[PDB]
Design a protein around this ligand. Structure first.
Ligand SMILES: CNc1nc2cc(C(N)=O)ccc2[nH]1
Ligand SMILES: CNc1nc2cc(C(N)=O)ccc2[nH]1
Ligand SMILES: [Cl-]
Ligand SMILES: [Cl-]
Ligand SMILES: [Zn+2]
Ligand SMILES: [Zn+2]
Lengths: 369, 369
């Protein structure tokens, strides 16, 4: 039987790594992309279709699930895995980002908020909610500093996040069944400031976590600045644990983040933009609503191995999306998630073969041609 | 290789019949239920899922397809079968019902209408559109008399429909590829009036068709009156050809119509009401939105063999529908279409075994308990 948590690095190229996370509910191949399952569903896909695209793990949103259908209710029904029919690992976010994005009164104890009914989130309650859901990878409860942030405000926010990281650690460890069966990741903060990022990394490593997220990015800073912060921030984290870049991102963001040592990603882009008509291809994204696709018999992408590209034309999917048909959302989403997984597979294989730098260059030349 | 069209009756009980229609693109088991594929999609289902539920044939809507994406466009892309990915028989309605329901200037030539752009439908253009789509069962272009109708107006409308039935026959026969590969059904009209129904049946049998629809019902008259009209109307049609009741209906409508000699059905009820939260069960319909289902771990129906009932709870589907999630529409629709197909299978098996009258009684006692 698999362990609670084991991360093994099988191959490296520069800062990039490829390997596996073994957990009780399955193996996660890294670098990994996690489809987002907001309200206990990856939108427009059955779980078997999510798995068929190659996903090893999905993300669930604590903030949404605690509001609807409710964490205690999900626990009474047997947990999130049983409820939605996904039996593999699930990583849950802590709610700290979405509570400030979608709901607030902030204090050292936590955050009180009104649902978009009054509710409360603290390190202790966030960890408890993630336990009730039956999460496999639990995220510490933090504060995602807005961008831009002054050094003083970034420091105060990071310091609070580090105090909350210790509270998250202790709450997780107090719950025997959670501590024995799930993993806990800490979140580095510090905005764009190298000294704060170092202080945050040091605090998290002193507490000790199973993996380390780079928080506070993809908040409006742009790719150049995100990459600049990753350049110095990722090396500060323990090398032997997974590095998770939260909320990223576009295909080119993923490639460059892997070049900088990131092992895990999540983003709503493939699902949300798929429903809006944007399809990812190796020649860049296309908007299938465009009239130029109305009689195009080619698949969404000429090389993609997904079931959508084996079976339906651009012309048909164009019609479905223009007509507002549910099947349009289904087909666009399956293709986009499959494309993302094929990207991750090419990344993993190229690192394993010592040709990832060439892959990244070739990928960019074609994607942006 | 299968013939263009062969209907064979394998077993009978009273007025009920069970058998098969063999066509080039597949065999249709009768009595048959056709899921409705309005705009080149059975809403929220891949074609493989439609087939997995047991459907042998689907219905396409000429009125919608001629407006979006266009009949000539579908032909240029290879036909409706290729376009949507359904390789089995498709029956297309003629557009006459939907043009008056959804769009008008009526004349002996046809109907001119504004899209909900000005457009035209005549017997000749309707048959041509159905050819361009590549329909396997083509419906004659008619006029669905509103209910209630005075005897004079019902007669005038039926007489026009019979003139249009001859024009439909001649247009179909003029097109060699259509005449050799598709079938043509005529539509009986005459409102609720026995003498007009007889005149219409006689006119259609004189022209000669591959099958005969009972038109003009399920237009507000209620089940008692629909059954009363079927009592005298179905025996007027040729016994050796299929009898198609257009736009019907609820499970109990289907059972009673089979008792009266109907072989084919279509209805949006399972798909449309599924998206609205109504699930069919052997104990009657339920509305999954109801709070009583929020913690109900049972499947939608306790006996249903569909993939939804094998895998997900009422509680989960309740959550999805309340949240407006696409997967809720997908799961409700797959279950409802599967339920309808299981109903048709039980009907076919009970007729084959000479126990359909008992099945109908047992079905009604439980469904309405
Ligand atoms: C889409 N961007 C994004 N940045 C994030 C940062 C965090 C975080 N906790 O710092 C979480 C989710 C995030 N999503
Ligand atoms: C839902 N009721 C319904 N009655 C129909 C009658 C016709 C007809 N052509 O008489 C066609 C479609 C129909 N749908
Ligand atoms: Cl999404
Ligand atoms: Cl529908
Ligand atoms: Zn694809
Ligand atoms: Zn079912």
């Amino acid at each position: 039987d698999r362990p609670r948590f084991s991360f093994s690095i099988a191959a490296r190229e520069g800062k990039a790594r490829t390997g596996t996370i073994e957990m009780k509910r399955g193996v996660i191949r890294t670098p990994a992309f996690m489809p987002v399952g907001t309200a206990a569903t990856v939108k427009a896909l059955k779980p078997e279709t999510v798995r068929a695209t190659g996903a090893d793990i999905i993300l669930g949103n604590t903030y949404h699930l605690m509001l609807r259908p409710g964490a205690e209710r999900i626990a009474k029904l047997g947990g999130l895995h049983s409820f939605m029919g996904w039996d593999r690992p699930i990583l849950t976010d802590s709610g700290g980002y979405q509570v400030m994005s979608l709901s607030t009164k902030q204090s050292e104890e936590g955050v009180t908020f009104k649902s978009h009914s009054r509710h409360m989130l603290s390190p202790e309650r966030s960890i408890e909610i993630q336990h009730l859901l039956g999460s496999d990878i639990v995220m510490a409860f933090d504060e995602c500093t807005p961008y831009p942030a002054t050094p003083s405000r970034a420091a105060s926010s990071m310091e609070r996040s580090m105090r909350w990281a210790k509270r998250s650690r202790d709450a997780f460890d107090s719950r025997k069944e959670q501590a024995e069966n799930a993993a806990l990741f800490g979140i580095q903060q510090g905005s764009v400031f190298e000294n704060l990022r170092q202080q945050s990394a040091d605090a998290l490593a002193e507490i000790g976590f199973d993996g380390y997220a780079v928080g506070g990015l993809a908040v409006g800073e742009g790719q150049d600045e995100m990459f600049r912060v990753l350049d110095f921030s990722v090396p500060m984290l323990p090398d032997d644990k997974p590095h998770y870049l939260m909320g990223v991102g576009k295909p080119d963001d993923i490639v460059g983040a892997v070049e900088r040592g990131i092992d895990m990603f999540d983003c709503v882009l493939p699902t949300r933009s798929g429903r809006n008509g944007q399809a990812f291809t190796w020649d860049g994204p296309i908007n299938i609503r465009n009239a130029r696709f109305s009689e195009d018999l080619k698949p969404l992408d000429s090389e993609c191995h997904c079931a959508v590209c084996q079976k339906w034309s651009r012309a048909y999917i164009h019609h479905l999306i223009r007509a507002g048909e549910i099947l349009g959302a289904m087909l666009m989403t399956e293709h986009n998630i499959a494309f993302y997984q094929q990207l991750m597979q090419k990344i993993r294989d190229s690192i394993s073969e010592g040709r990832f730098s060439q892959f990244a260059q070739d990928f960019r030349a074609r994607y942006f041609a």
